[PDB]
Amino acid sequence: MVNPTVFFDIAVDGEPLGRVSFELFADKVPKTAENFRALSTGEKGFGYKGSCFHRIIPGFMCQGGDFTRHNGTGGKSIYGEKFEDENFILKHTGPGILSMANAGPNTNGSQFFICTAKTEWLDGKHVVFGKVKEGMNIVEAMERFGSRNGKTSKKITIADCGQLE
Ligand SMILES: Nc1ncccc1Cl
Ligand SMILES: Nc1ncccc1Cl
């Protein structure tokens, strides 16, 4: 009944930076929220721990979740390699939005991005399923290690992750 909360503990070239937590909108997008929640706990035997934010573009987004190819070409969901676009109820309203990366319709895997700007042109194309709850400052810090082309100047990792409450 209560939306779950997950955390990532972010490191920058292995140095602790801080914690970002997310509310997952399981009330709106249960299937997509469950995927992210289980990948954050690692309870299916794989997931986000130790993965990186391989693409960070300041004033746009931080993308991560590619734990199989580490570069934006990989990842898998808890349902199989890909799963459908659950719905597009929630929109890309501003910084902090948590949304699924994809390579076309119905190609959700594990990769996700945290918005650092409003990205309304993604509405109805990427599934929005959560939002930063605490540590938007940490995301802003992360974002400073990006670049226009998305390459990061330091390795931004999810040193630890899991479920809170
Ligand atoms: N292509 C697919 N096949 C089976 C289940 C879900 C998807 Cl997206
Ligand atoms: N395999 C992928 N999964 C999610 C986003 C983008 C790609 Cl190429």
Side-chain angles (χ1 to χ4, degrees):
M1 212 179 187
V2 200
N3 278 342
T5 301
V6 290
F7 75 86
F8 291 169
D9 286 332
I10 303 295
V12 175
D13 285 346
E15 310 288 353
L17 175 65
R19 176 175 285 192
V20 186
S21 65
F22 312 90
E23 180 181 355
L24 308 181
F25 299 133
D27 57 346
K28 294 270 156 41
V29 269
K31 190 170 175 163
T32 302
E34 175 64 8
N35 178 65
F36 187 92
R37 186 208 65 77
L39 293 167
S40 290
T41 66
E43 68 196 63
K44 307 287 190 202
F46 48 89
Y48 298 138
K49 188 180 176 167
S51 67
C52 79
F53 285 86
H54 64 274
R55 187 173 194 245
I56 299 177
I57 302 168
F60 179 14
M61 55 153 190
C62 299
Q63 184 169 329
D66 188 356
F67 62 81
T68 72
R69 302 178 63 64
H70 332 296
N71 68 357
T73 69
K76 66 182 184 183
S77 79
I78 68 170
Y79 309 119
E81 203 204 309
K82 314 193 139 178
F83 67 110
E84 69 275 11
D85 300 313
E86 181 168 11
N87 66 60
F88 300 102
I89 295 177
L90 298 170
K91 309 310 176 183
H92 297 83
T93 52
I97 289 296
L98 187 58
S99 182
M100 287 305 285
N102 68 49
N106 305 303
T107 61
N108 298 293
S110 57
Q111 285 189 65
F112 64 83
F113 61 107
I114 303 166
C115 302
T116 57
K118 192 172 172 189
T119 63
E120 74 181 307
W121 59 89
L122 302 178
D123 291 352
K125 180 163 63 164
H126 297 263
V127 182
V128 172
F129 67 98
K131 185 166 187 42
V132 175
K133 177 173 178 186
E134 291 193 281
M136 199 62 209
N137 56 316
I138 300 308
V139 175
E140 300 164 356
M142 286 168 55
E143 182 186 24
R144 291 173 204 118
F145 297 104
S147 71
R148 284 290 308 275
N149 67 31
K151 175 94 180 289
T152 61
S153 65
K154 303 194 178 294
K155 185 70 162 182
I156 309 303
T157 56
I158 297 173
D160 203 10
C161 54
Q163 192 168 356
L164 298 175
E165 315 149 351

